[model samples]
Target: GFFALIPKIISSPLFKTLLSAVGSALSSSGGQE
Candidate 1:
């Protein structure tokens, strides 16, 4: 089993920001059509 600190990580502002940035990039199709 993979140990994940997801909840704790996402709870942090820094981690949340990183997550948001990655999600945004993916959701935006990497800014390239």
Candidate 2:
């Protein structure tokens, strides 16, 4: 059922924002512990 939705989600801005957030989280979280 999600097959049709997957393509649209991957192409959405939220997906990019999610990835960018994870990347920034990883970058900012390092060297603090």
Candidate 3:
């Protein structure tokens, strides 16, 4: 069941925020992949 908790971790606000920031930086850097 612990392995199934990955989705919950990804759906968390903190996780989303961190991803958003990272993605934004990547996009700004012109990373198209």
Candidate 4:
């Protein structure tokens, strides 16, 4: 059930935007370091 649920959650548009936003934020901070 948990594994099956993961795909649906990750497939969402909101989740994708949130993920990209987080990814860029982390990359920018790490790049400065």
lDDT of candidate 3 over 1-33, digit per residue (tens): 566654565665567667667657756866554
Q: TM-score for every candidate vs. truth?
A: 0.35, 0.32, 0.37, 0.36
Q: Give the TM-score of candidate 1.
A: 0.35
lDDT of 2: 0.63
Q: What is the lDDT of residue 1 in candidate 2?
A: 41
lDDT of 3: 0.63
Clashes of 2: 0
Query: How accurate locally, in lDDT, is each candidate?
Result: 0.62, 0.63, 0.63, 0.63
lDDT of 2 at 5: 56
Better of 1 and 4 by TM-score: 4
Clashing pairs in 3: none
**Candidate 4 — worst ten consecutive residues by lDDT sum?**
5-14
Q: Candidate 3 at 23: error in angstroms?
A: 0.3
Cα displacement (Å) at residue 13, model 3: 12
Candidate 4, residue 11: Cα displacement in angstroms equals 9.2
Off by over 4 Å in 1: 1-14, 30-33
Off by over 4 Å in 2: 1-15
